[PDB]
Amino acid sequence: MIQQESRLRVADNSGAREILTIKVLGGSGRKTANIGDVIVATVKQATPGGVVKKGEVVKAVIVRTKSGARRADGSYIKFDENAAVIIRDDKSPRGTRIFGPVARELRENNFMKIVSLAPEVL
Amino acid sequence: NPLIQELTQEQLRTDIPAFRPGDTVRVHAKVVEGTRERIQLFEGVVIKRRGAGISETYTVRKVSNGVGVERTFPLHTPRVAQIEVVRYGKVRRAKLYYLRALHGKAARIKEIRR
Amino acid sequence: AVPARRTSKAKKAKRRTHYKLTIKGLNACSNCGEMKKSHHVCPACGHYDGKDV
Amino acid sequence: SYRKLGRTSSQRKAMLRDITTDLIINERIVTTEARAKEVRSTVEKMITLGKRGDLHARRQAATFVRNEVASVREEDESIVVESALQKLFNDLGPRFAERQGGYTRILKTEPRRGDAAPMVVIEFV
Amino acid sequence: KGILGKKVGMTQIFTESGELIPVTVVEATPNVVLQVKTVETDGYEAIQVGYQDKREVLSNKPAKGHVAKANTAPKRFIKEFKNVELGEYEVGKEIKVDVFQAGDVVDVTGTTKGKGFQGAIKRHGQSRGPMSHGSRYHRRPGSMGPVAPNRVFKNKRLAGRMGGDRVTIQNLEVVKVDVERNVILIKGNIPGAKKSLITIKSAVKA
RNA sequence: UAGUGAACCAGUACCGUGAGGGAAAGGUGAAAAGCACCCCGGAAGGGGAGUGAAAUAGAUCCUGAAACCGUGUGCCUACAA
RNA sequence: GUAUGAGUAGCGAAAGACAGGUGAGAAUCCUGUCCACCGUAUGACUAAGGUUUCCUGGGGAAGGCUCGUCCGCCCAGGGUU
RNA sequence: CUCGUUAAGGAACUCGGCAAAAUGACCCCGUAACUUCGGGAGAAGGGGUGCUGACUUCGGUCAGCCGCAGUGAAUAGGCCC
RNA sequence: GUAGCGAAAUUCCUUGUCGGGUAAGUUCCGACCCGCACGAAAGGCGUAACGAUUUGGGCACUGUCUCAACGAGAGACUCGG
RNA sequence: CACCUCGAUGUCGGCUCGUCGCAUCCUGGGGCUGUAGUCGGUCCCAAGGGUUGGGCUGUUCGCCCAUUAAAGCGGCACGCGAGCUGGGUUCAGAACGUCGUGAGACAGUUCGGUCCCUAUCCGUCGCGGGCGUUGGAAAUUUGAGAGGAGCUGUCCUUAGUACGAGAGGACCGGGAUGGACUUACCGCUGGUGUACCAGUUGUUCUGCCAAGGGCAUUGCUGGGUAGCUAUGUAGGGAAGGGAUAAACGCUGAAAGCAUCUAAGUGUGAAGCCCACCUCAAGAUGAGAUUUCCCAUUUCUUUAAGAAAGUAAGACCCCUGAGAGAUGAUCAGGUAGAUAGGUUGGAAGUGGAAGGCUAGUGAUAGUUGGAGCGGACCAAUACUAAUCGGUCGAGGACUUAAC
Ligand SMILES: [K+]
Ligand SMILES: [K+]
Ligand SMILES: [K+]
Ligand SMILES: [K+]
Ligand SMILES: [K+]
Ligand SMILES: [K+]
Ligand SMILES: [K+]
Ligand SMILES: [K+]
Ligand SMILES: [K+]
Ligand SMILES: [K+]
Ligand SMILES: [K+]
Ligand SMILES: [K+]
Ligand SMILES: [K+]
Ligand SMILES: [K+]
Ligand SMILES: [K+]
Ligand SMILES: [K+]
Ligand SMILES: [K+]
Ligand SMILES: [K+]
Ligand SMILES: [K+]
Ligand SMILES: [K+]
Ligand SMILES: [K+]
Ligand SMILES: [K+]
Ligand SMILES: [K+]
Ligand SMILES: [K+]
Ligand SMILES: [K+]
Ligand SMILES: [K+]
Ligand SMILES: [K+]
Ligand SMILES: [K+]
Ligand SMILES: [K+]
Ligand SMILES: [Mg+2]
Ligand SMILES: [Mg+2]
Ligand SMILES: [Mg+2]
Ligand SMILES: [Mg+2]
Ligand SMILES: [Mg+2]
Ligand SMILES: [Mg+2]
Ligand SMILES: [Mg+2]
Ligand SMILES: [Mg+2]
Ligand SMILES: [Mg+2]
Ligand SMILES: [Mg+2]
Ligand SMILES: [Mg+2]
Ligand SMILES: [Mg+2]
Ligand SMILES: [Mg+2]
Ligand SMILES: [Mg+2]
Ligand SMILES: [Mg+2]
Ligand SMILES: [Mg+2]
Ligand SMILES: [Mg+2]
Ligand SMILES: [Mg+2]
Ligand SMILES: [Mg+2]
Ligand SMILES: [Mg+2]
Ligand SMILES: [Mg+2]
Ligand SMILES: [Mg+2]
Ligand SMILES: [Mg+2]
Ligand SMILES: [Mg+2]
Ligand SMILES: [Mg+2]
Ligand SMILES: [Mg+2]
Ligand SMILES: [Mg+2]
Ligand SMILES: [Mg+2]
Ligand SMILES: [Mg+2]
Ligand SMILES: [Mg+2]
Ligand SMILES: [Mg+2]
Ligand SMILES: [Mg+2]
Ligand SMILES: [Mg+2]
Ligand SMILES: [Mg+2]
Ligand SMILES: [Mg+2]
Ligand SMILES: [Mg+2]
Ligand SMILES: [Mg+2]
Ligand SMILES: [Mg+2]
Ligand SMILES: [Mg+2]
Ligand SMILES: [Mg+2]
Ligand SMILES: [Mg+2]
Ligand SMILES: [Zn+2]
């Protein structure tokens, strides 16, 4: 459950390290965003040499959350942190490498490039 | 409640091994990426067992790529091909939530060899 | 908040219509015949259900 | 469920222990409705421990019963004192060895003057 | 199609394809058609159905006389079903869970669990007031209205008794029917406390 | 409720550190003859029995208004603003 | 003087429980047991202040925010070397 | 009203982080700009704390043991620009 | 009207203009000076330390909030006084 | 302007709660277009629903950031302070600029500055008692009327088709899946869970060891049953009719033509009435169906008379929860499983005590998935629902028909 002001790690090497949620897209009054949702965020802390830099307004996709997801089979997945990946408008990640595991729900959300790049999909 | 037990006795599985929280398990979880179906092994320590009868569930935690991941499965889910007890651990409680805080060496569990 | 108008005698009596006691569950004690509350030990003879206690 | 008896948790526990020990000692006591309806269960469970009679039940009961003097007698030209726990495991247990629960009865009496509180007598059958 | 049963409880079921769904177990001992209502006699068409055989000491002479026509023991519950084919039913006929088939879409009617006296925040899901910043307004029902009317409009929702209302859930799925146990497994959850009356009818919307 | 604040143990009771401020409160019956004795009640208080012309003159005692409270009922009243 | 509000607010920080006794009458008084509270005090002395509230034997009119057989209250005696 | 806990988020509340939360004991390391050279400073930021043996130069050290956690409860600074 | 300071506890026009901070800053900080209407003991400018002072930012922390849920106690509720 | 209020009508902004108007922001329908298409512009009908999260500022307003289909305008004492706040305005303190000789003053600024009231009546939200509904009862019911709901995004297909030179790119039609809102529920994820289990500190008590009890916020800490719960789960606003708005007609004269109209006749919207959900015969207009009891006794009186035993039945009282402030509702009262206890289980916890073994020891293993186990499950009359009591009909008249 990611909402406005919620801070997330960056699971890619685009340069940004921590981002702050600005908006939860997908509805006028939508409050919370979960795995597979795209958010407007701001780069609060950036790697010095990265492409993306501090203070830029960016779009990112949630790739793992403390409150994770429930599968049609009745199973659940939860992660130990909330992380997102910065994406271009066409869902292509700004960075080149993904860090840490990723949720399998991104597949049906059609983030195929991120799914492929992920070191592991669960 | 007896009626519920009788109704769900049919779907209760019978190939479940005897495992308790603290035992490392390998879960042959079926996964489908389309038409194709596949078995992905989720191996980790059992952190929680709760519920009863058909509603029983268990949680397995593993640190993958430096990020903890916890998967909760219905004990009698047909989507899990097999549960294989890789190891038995010595734990002093039913719920091992405290492990979520620990990392690496601190999270080690001594083996008992039941 | 305070009474805008004093309550008249009739209105007061109407409100008190339901302000009354009741006496229920009195019946003859099987042992001595004196009245007693049902399901209670008769205070006169000390019996209940045909036995002294 | 269980009643709160207008006390905090610890105070209610202490009051129930006191009343249960008093009922063990005297075998007949006058209390209020709610106090009786809780003491019945507590004392019957103590009696169950007594009927079991093993050391485990002895100590489990000791965790509850008060350390009071159940009775005193003159025997062997000497005074013998029996505590509530000893009475529980020597008399009440063997007494009720054949009864399958329901060792206590409650009789409804007149309400108290100072409160109109519905009073009852609770006693071992 | 309709039937009366008892909300046994809730569990979960694995279906084909391995999906896990929560179901409510509702038991319905064969109900009995006690009376047939017709336009000529009553002005409308419906069938009276009784359920949950009831002890004679719990029944009355008028109730026994009423159920005599059907020749059955006293029933604890009686309800009328409309939108049914009067031709297909007659006094003394039995109705069983087998009337429904797995995958049927039904309306389930119950009496919601009672919550006693409840405040407006819970009873109507209204917003609380701030809990700090000197606020002395926490769980109160808001303003009662404008000054001009010199009164309070009807439907100014306030605290009161919550629950115990007749509630219908539409388009629930009949997961399973066990005729041997007189059981229906209905996907989802249904109103009412366990052992309360439940009414299943063929979904009107469909 | 007048008449001195004070017809009565009043400049008292009471209030205020103090100067000071400052009340309420009369009437059994001709005569106590002030209800011996009995009954209920722990007493109080009553019911008899007595005194008395009168006791609904019984000491809160001459008369006993109104507000207020209660009992019994001749009539009316639960579709009315 | 008496109403209305109204038999409503309030009954002023906190643990009592049972057995026995007393008594017309007991949650409220005495005794007993256990339990619980304070313990740089909620203990032990003293100055001021109060001025008999100290003790013993009775009482339950009024006071005690309930009750009361009890009291720092009332009645009778005594008590400060 | 007083108090305990609370998923995910963590000031988005709000005039205002009001209130609440967090820090808090002792031992060790370490500690900036600026400065009136005294301070800042308990800056900051970190580490240790239980039990049992052996040995101690008596403060320790080595080894072992247990728990989720060792000032195991209570009382004890939030900090910085 | 000098030095010094200047949209200031003083700047109405005014959220002056520019830069920093923020995703976004009428507040805040830095700078400019057309100072409506600063200015040198009703002192000018600066200043270490200090402040239950006013103001802005940050970390930690949290129901403050998204958005409320449960539980304990006192009152409210029923009964007796 | 000065008509009510100065023997007091509380003033901005915000919060909670909304409700109403339509001069309509979106959604719906339509005409014209300098409407190719996609976008639009303007106007007509339309108020059913919805119409946001922040930075700044006491703010309204406004700018900005990021979204949305949209981010409407207004009234209701610029709604709502006996519902809340009190940042601003507007007391007493103090200061700056300015004015004044001065006390002081400034819709000029700045720091700080007590928001009382136990609801009598109406009104509103819920719950009872009485009587009526014309013999007395137990159930089921029709529906006069009333309330609730009413929103919408994206994607796929039709189709890269119609259109367009190209770029670009549809109407209608058919599917999938969301946002917000909302009705229920605890099987799942979690929260809570103060008479569940375990660890642990200090002190104190059970004579001591051992094992335990008291207090320390439930002493603290790790879990957790039922119940209550959302963020968790399931469902909903679906299809469809009738009459219409603007609009479009068809036939048709007045007025040989023309003309939607005068007669006649039709299409037409998230709009109206139904349809969906809920309450509903105190709807005194008091309805309807099935079932049960039966015409008693005495005295008065031809009385629709009175009381007194009843019948069908209801209640008192007692055991309770799925119910609950109390009434009430519902489950039961030995014709018994209503509750307590007991027995057996379950969740839950995590391996009891006493031994045994190993170890100098802390401690580990074993006896043993042990011990304990509130609300959960099933049996069991062992305890308590005993004995009893109260209330409760005999059915008016007129006139059609039979
Ligand atoms: K006289
Ligand atoms: K009268
Ligand atoms: K008065
Ligand atoms: K009164
Ligand atoms: K005395
Ligand atoms: K502000
Ligand atoms: K500092
Ligand atoms: K440690
Ligand atoms: K300190
Ligand atoms: K300037
Ligand atoms: K100035
Ligand atoms: K800027
Ligand atoms: K300062
Ligand atoms: K200060
Ligand atoms: K809290
Ligand atoms: K918020
Ligand atoms: K005025
Ligand atoms: K148009
Ligand atoms: K509208
Ligand atoms: K703001
Ligand atoms: K409005
Ligand atoms: K106010
Ligand atoms: K009025
Ligand atoms: K919990
Ligand atoms: K101890
Ligand atoms: K103690
Ligand atoms: K009726
Ligand atoms: K053992
Ligand atoms: K077990
Ligand atoms: Mg388990
Ligand atoms: Mg305690
Ligand atoms: Mg005792
Ligand atoms: Mg809110
Ligand atoms: Mg009016
Ligand atoms: Mg005078
Ligand atoms: Mg006279
Ligand atoms: Mg007189
Ligand atoms: Mg009428
Ligand atoms: Mg009338
Ligand atoms: Mg009142
Ligand atoms: Mg007191
Ligand atoms: Mg103490
Ligand atoms: Mg101290
Ligand atoms: Mg004395
Ligand atoms: Mg004395
Ligand atoms: Mg008194
Ligand atoms: Mg939280
Ligand atoms: Mg958390
Ligand atoms: Mg803010
Ligand atoms: Mg805000
Ligand atoms: Mg604070
Ligand atoms: Mg500590
Ligand atoms: Mg500026
Ligand atoms: Mg700027
Ligand atoms: Mg000056
Ligand atoms: Mg000068
Ligand atoms: Mg100066
Ligand atoms: Mg009372
Ligand atoms: Mg004039
Ligand atoms: Mg006036
Ligand atoms: Mg219009
Ligand atoms: Mg901020
Ligand atoms: Mg206003
Ligand atoms: Mg007002
Ligand atoms: Mg001057
Ligand atoms: Mg201040
Ligand atoms: Mg749940
Ligand atoms: Mg459950
Ligand atoms: Mg010991
Ligand atoms: Mg049962
Ligand atoms: Zn008797």
Side-chain angles (χ1 to χ4, degrees):
Chain A
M1 298 177 62
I2 303 300
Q3 61 184 235
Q4 183 179 325
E5 309 299 325
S6 181
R7 295 210 183 184
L8 310 86
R9 315 302 80 75
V10 176
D12 65 67
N13 64 328
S14 60
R17 297 168 58 87
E18 164 174 300
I19 58 176
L20 181 142
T21 310
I22 290 170
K23 255 290 174 299
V24 168
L25 300 178
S28 62
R30 188 167 183 178
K31 296 291 182 187
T32 172
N34 48 90
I35 294 170
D37 296 327
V38 180
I39 62 180
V40 183
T42 308
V43 188
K44 290 294 186 184
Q45 182 175 349
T47 302
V51 168
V52 176
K53 58 180 58 47
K54 184 183 183 305
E56 185 181 8
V57 183
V58 308
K59 287 186 185 295
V61 56
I62 299 164
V63 304
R64 61 175 90 98
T65 63
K66 295 252 292 196
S67 75
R70 181 182 65 88
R71 307 285 168 73
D73 61 16
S75 65
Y76 301 80
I77 184 172
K78 295 184 180 63
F79 302 81
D80 290 11
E81 68 182 24
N82 318 325
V85 170
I86 306 187
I87 63 181
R88 277 173 271 273
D89 197 320
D90 63 2
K91 303 181 178 178
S92 60
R94 296 276 284 277
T96 60
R97 311 202 291 115
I98 304 299
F99 295 112
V102 169
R104 199 187 317 283
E105 283 65 353
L106 303 193
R107 291 177 64 84
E108 47 267 33
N109 296 272
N110 197 25
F111 293 77
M112 308 311 305
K113 184 50 163 290
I114 292 172
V115 172
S116 66
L117 293 170
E120 184 184 24
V121 185
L122 301 168
Chain B
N1 167 87
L3 192 57
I4 297 174
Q5 290 173 201
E6 294 176 23
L7 287 153
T8 64
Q9 211 290 337
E10 180 187 3
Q11 285 202 358
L12 283 178
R13 280 177 77 107
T14 318
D15 47 0
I16 306 304
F19 69 93
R20 66 185 63 183
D23 311 324
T24 295
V25 307
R26 181 178 303 99
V27 181
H28 303 53
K30 295 156 172 282
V31 306
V32 299
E33 67 288 8
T35 50
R36 175 165 175 261
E37 173 171 311
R38 176 168 62 88
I39 295 287
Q40 186 183 54
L41 300 169
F42 187 87
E43 180 178 329
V45 63
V46 178
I47 297 299
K48 170 181 192 177
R49 283 190 62 163
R50 71 154 297 279
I54 193 68
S55 291
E56 185 151 18
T57 71
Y58 63 100
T59 287
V60 187
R61 175 190 173 83
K62 75 183 293 185
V63 183
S64 63
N65 300 120
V67 183
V69 188
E70 306 167 16
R71 300 277 279 113
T72 305
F73 300 98
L75 191 62
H76 309 286
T77 182
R79 293 296 198 83
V80 166
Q82 181 188 349
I83 310 175
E84 179 186 358
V85 183
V86 183
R87 297 196 304 273
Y88 301 105
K90 191 203 159 48
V91 306
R92 297 298 308 272
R93 51 201 70 264
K95 308 295 181 294
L96 310 184
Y97 296 138
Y98 70 91
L99 286 172
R100 296 169 180 166
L102 300 178
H103 291 76
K105 286 206 183 72
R108 294 177 297 184
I109 308 181
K110 303 179 182 178
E111 200 176 8
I112 55 183
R113 305 173 293 95
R114 286 192 183 281
Chain C
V2 309
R5 307 287 305 121
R6 70 182 297 164
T7 303
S8 83
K9 306 190 189 191
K11 181 62 175 173
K12 178 173 65 179
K14 285 185 174 184
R15 189 182 63 259
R16 295 175 180 175
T17 293
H18 292 285
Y19 178 66
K20 55 182 179 178
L21 302 173
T22 57
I23 185 64
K24 294 182 181 179
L26 298 186
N27 54 17
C29 168
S30 172
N31 173 75
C32 62
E34 283 293 339
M35 217 63 59
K36 72 168 197 64
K37 297 171 71 170
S38 65
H39 303 77
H40 290 66
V41 186
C42 170
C45 62
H47 288 46
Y48 180 77
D49 196 358
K51 288 179 292 302
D52 183 77
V53 297
Chain D
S1 171
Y2 54 83
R3 292 177 173 85
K4 294 165 174 177
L5 305 178
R7 315 294 179 90
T8 64
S9 54
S10 83
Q11 298 182 358
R12 173 173 58 267
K13 178 183 178 188
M15 189 181 69
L16 288 176
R17 292 180 64 183
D18 287 326
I19 298 174
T20 301
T21 306
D22 296 332
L23 177 50
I24 287 170
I25 292 174
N26 304 272
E27 307 181 344
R28 179 194 167 95
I29 64 178
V30 194
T31 75
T32 70
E33 283 295 350
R35 295 178 176 180
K37 290 187 173 182
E38 306 292 324
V39 167
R40 58 179 175 172
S41 76
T42 63
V43 71
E44 286 189 36
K45 293 184 187 306
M46 295 297 98
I47 289 171
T48 303
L49 297 178
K51 297 213 305 190
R52 265 179 50 185
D54 61 68
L55 180 62
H56 197 42
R58 174 96 64 163
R59 300 194 171 184
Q60 287 183 230
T63 72
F64 191 87
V65 176
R66 300 291 181 186
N67 187 21
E68 292 193 5
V69 177
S71 62
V72 62
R73 296 95 67 171
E74 182 170 358
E75 171 177 319
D76 304 324
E77 303 299 337
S78 180
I79 284 64
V80 173
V81 184
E82 186 178 24
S83 68
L85 189 61
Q86 291 171 348
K87 172 175 176 179
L88 177 63
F89 271 64
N90 301 342
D91 171 22
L92 303 174
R95 182 197 306 190
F96 292 111
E98 312 309 332
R99 289 202 79 89
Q100 277 53 228
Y103 313 116
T104 67
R105 60 161 53 91
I106 306 174
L107 305 162
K108 309 189 183 305
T109 66
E110 312 310 325
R112 198 147 63 186
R113 179 186 178 276
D115 298 335
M119 309 305 291
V120 309
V121 176
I122 192 176
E123 57 175 354
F124 298 141
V125 302
Chain E
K1 293 165 56 174
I3 193 180
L4 302 164
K6 131 180 69 170
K7 173 173 176 179
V8 173
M10 286 202 72
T11 186
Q12 58 190 29
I13 276 290
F14 301 99
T15 65
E16 306 307 334
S17 73
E19 182 182 3
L20 176 56
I21 56 175
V23 304
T24 308
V25 187
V26 167
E27 188 183 33
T29 309
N31 317 148
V32 184
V33 177
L34 305 171
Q35 180 191 356
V36 184
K37 298 203 165 180
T38 67
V39 178
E40 297 79 3
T41 54
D42 289 345
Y44 74 100
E45 295 176 11
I47 65 183
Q48 190 182 45
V49 175
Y51 161 71
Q52 187 159 333
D53 281 352
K54 185 195 203 180
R55 281 201 272 107
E56 280 56 9
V57 60
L58 303 178
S59 181
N60 314 341
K61 275 183 64 56
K64 297 171 187 175
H66 179 53
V67 302
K69 303 282 182 58
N71 184 28
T72 48
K75 301 294 180 174
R76 184 167 306 286
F77 298 100
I78 303 175
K79 296 292 182 184
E80 284 191 20
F81 287 107
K82 310 172 68 176
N83 303 337
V84 296
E85 302 75 3
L86 297 203
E88 300 188 338
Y89 300 95
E90 63 176 12
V91 178
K93 177 175 182 177
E94 283 198 355
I95 301 178
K96 292 182 181 59
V97 298
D98 60 62
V99 165
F100 296 108
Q101 294 74 348
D104 282 327
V105 185
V106 301
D107 305 334
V108 181
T109 304
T111 299
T112 63
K113 301 178 78 174
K115 287 80 174 61
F117 205 106
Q118 294 301 335
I121 296 297
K122 178 190 288 294
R123 192 190 169 188
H124 307 289
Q126 297 190 352
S127 166
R128 275 158 43 263
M131 309 298 291
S132 74
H133 299 286
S135 175
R136 296 193 293 188
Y137 202 81
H138 300 342
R139 302 187 64 83
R140 293 168 177 279
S143 174
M144 306 285 290
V147 175
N150 293 342
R151 69 185 181 92
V152 173
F153 287 158
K154 297 177 171 295
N155 290 338
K156 165 58 191 184
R157 313 211 293 278
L158 294 168
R161 187 148 296 175
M162 185 183 182
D165 302 320
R166 170 184 171 89
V167 164
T168 301
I169 310 301
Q170 289 183 346
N171 303 349
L172 289 180
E173 189 179 353
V174 183
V175 168
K176 199 213 290 181
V177 181
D178 181 315
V179 306
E180 287 69 17
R181 298 188 174 88
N182 294 316
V183 167
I184 303 185
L185 314 190
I186 298 173
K187 185 174 179 180
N189 37 22
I190 69 186
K194 286 179 286 190
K195 306 166 65 177
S196 65
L197 184 66
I198 299 292
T199 304
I200 312 297
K201 308 184 298 304
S202 66
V204 62
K205 291 287 193 67

